Amino acid sequence: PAFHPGELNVYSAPGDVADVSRALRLTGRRVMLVPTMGALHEGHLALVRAAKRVPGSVVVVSIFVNPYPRTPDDDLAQLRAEGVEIAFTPTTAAMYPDGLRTTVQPGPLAAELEGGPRPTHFAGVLTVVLKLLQIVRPDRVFFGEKDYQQLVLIRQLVADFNLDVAVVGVPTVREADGLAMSSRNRYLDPAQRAAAVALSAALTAAAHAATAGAQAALDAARAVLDAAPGVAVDYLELRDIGLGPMPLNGSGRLLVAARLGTTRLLDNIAIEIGTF
Amino acid sequence: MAIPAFHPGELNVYSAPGDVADVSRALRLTGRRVMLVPTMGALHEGHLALVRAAKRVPGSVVVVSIFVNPMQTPDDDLAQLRAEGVEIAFTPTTAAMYPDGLRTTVQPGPLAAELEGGPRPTHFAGVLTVVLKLLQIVRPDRVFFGEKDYQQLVLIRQLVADFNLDVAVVGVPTVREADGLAMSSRNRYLDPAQRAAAVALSAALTAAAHAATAGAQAALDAARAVLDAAPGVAVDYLELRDIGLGPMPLNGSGRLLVAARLGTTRLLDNIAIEIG
């Protein structure tokens, strides 16, 4: 396959990107992977920028939706402007020629929180991520921290399968009021958008409240969520940073998921208890 | 950062996954092609054939792993490897392989529920997980298995296809005793009557293969007849399938697989079949 350095090369076939990726690595370049479902926003640009600041790196951004917002004219233009040299955009047929066959079965974390009502959801995420990792074989792969449980499951996948890639979590880029960036924010009417600030407001309230201990942190977050119109909370949980089965100590992660109309929003934050 | 000690032309034993990973990387960067022979130790002639097939690749360095998977002849095994010119034995502990215990695993496609998956329903999940791990630690160019456990071999090829692994899977024809009995650690348990009756499995299969000019029913009936002539041979299945273990086509290449119990020992064998 042709590679044009300092231009955006778009590859469809896993074979093409795999050969280009390996050739590059051989000539000393480090391969950075940013896996996406497209519909790119500023948080993705932050993943790319962090990937680009890795010296001698070549950046690969993949755009692929398993089997939703699909806007690839926008997606590609942004990459060219950030100076990304590789977009990997495979077909479903190329990723899944045999359909669903060999799969990743996540540990029990995958049955908690987001996984509780969606029992195969993380199996599907870990299977596609493993496949992207094997196609591309990057040195480092980048994720936003907003989908924190998913990021922890990925660290599990990488440890548990001895995968030779460094996983980089990048702090969640926010709108000016604190709203975690998300593709799905577009689905909020003006009143829902106004109210949605409560998730991030609740979590920062909790993070400062936590000097007074874990119950006070939780109750602060809960009062903010309850003060907000049309916000229905699925969960609000405080956990170890690995998300269990450890009891929380002095440091943890506070996670929330809520529905505004039909739109589910997630957010999370670091929390120190007895602030520390 | 510093590569662990490796001495070309002799036997280098590592028990730490990170060490073998580092040696193997260092080796392929200097030209060598890395060949992986996974074993559970207690080496026999079947393993020495996997080994000889590996050594014959120009520029090969040979990694034999020795690992008994609880989820699935010592200084002696190592002596055998030395006498074969094997340069790397990988001998990890259970703790090294599973430092976080059992967590993320491989879930096999539906083939794992058939045939051997009938008696042992999660056996292949355990095999595919350890094989994925060994492949990721060693990162070989080629990996060598006997054709004796044929279903296991097909499932591994599904693993490799499905997860986009960049390794070649090499199946090496089954090594057999003088009378045709497929080498197996279990053979030494058979008393003389069982041992004499056991020849029926390979006898049935070769008869079928030669009968196949007369078609599929003729092949199967010949095999059955031969099995029916043996006392104490309790056949769990005798099945003709295509080379991928889906259903046998009209006419073309196939595989005939058999499994049976003699006293307390379970024996398997299989053979290439050509219809017509």
Ligand SMILES: COc1ccc2c(c1)cc(C(=O)NS(=O)(=O)c1ccc(C(F)(F)F)cc1)n2CC(=O)O
């Ligand atoms: C650095 O700041 C941010 C903030 C939010 C982010 C991101 C970065 C990245 C995402 C995100 O979800 N991207 S995405 O859905 O295309 C995505 C989804 C799933 C996976 C995974 F793990 F399966 F490969 C990767 C990217 N998201 C959240 C989102 O768009 O909902």
Ligand SMILES: COc1ccc2c(c1)cc(C(=O)NS(=O)(=O)c1ccc(C(F)(F)F)cc1)n2CC(=O)O
């Ligand atoms: C906890 O309650 C449930 C309900 C349904 C479940 C399960 C659990 C588990 C499965 C399941 O494992 N399905 S299956 O084909 O293994 C599977 C595995 C992986 C994927 C994925 F997401 F990778 F694509 C889909 C289905 N399934 C789907 C099934 O058994 O067909």
Ligand SMILES: COc1ccc2c(c1)cc(C(=O)NS(=O)(=O)c1ccc(C(F)(F)F)cc1)n2CC(=O)O
């Ligand atoms: C070239 O011909 C042969 C003939 C028989 C063989 C072999 C090769 C290899 C074996 C064998 O099982 N080796 S082993 O159990 O130590 C083994 C077990 C499991 C795996 C796997 F796939 F999990 F990686 C590999 C080797 N066996 C059968 C046995 O020893 O029971």
